[PDB]
Amino acid sequence: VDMSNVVKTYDLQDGSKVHVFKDGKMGMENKFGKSMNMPEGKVMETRDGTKIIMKGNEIFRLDEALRKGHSEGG
Numbered sequence: 001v002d003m004s005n006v007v008k009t010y011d012l013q014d015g016s017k018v019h020v021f022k023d024g025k026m027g028m029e030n031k032f033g034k035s036m037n038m039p040e041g042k043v044m045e046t047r048d049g050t051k052i053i054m055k056g057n058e059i060f061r062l063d064e065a066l067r068k069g070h071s072e073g074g
C-alpha cells in the first residue's frame with residue numbers, strides 16, 4: 001500500500017510491517033508493501049515490545065482503499 005495515507009508504521013518482530021493510516025486504522029502488510037492478510041486475535045509485537053492485537057476493527061482495513069486511488073469525492 002501507499003505510504004501517503006499512513007501516519008504511523010510499526011516494525012513487527014514477525015518481519016511484517018503495519019502501516020497505520022491517519023484515520024487511526026492500520027493496514028496490515030509486509031515491509032515490502034505486499035498485501036498480507038491477518039485475522040482477529042493475532043498479537044503483533046513491535047520492535048518496542050508493543051503488543052497490538054489485530055481486532056475486528058483493524059483486520060480488513062486496507063483492501064477498500066486498494067480498490068481505487070485517485071479522485072474519490074464520494
Ligand SMILES: [Cu+]
Binds near residue numbers: 053
Ligand atoms: Cu495484524
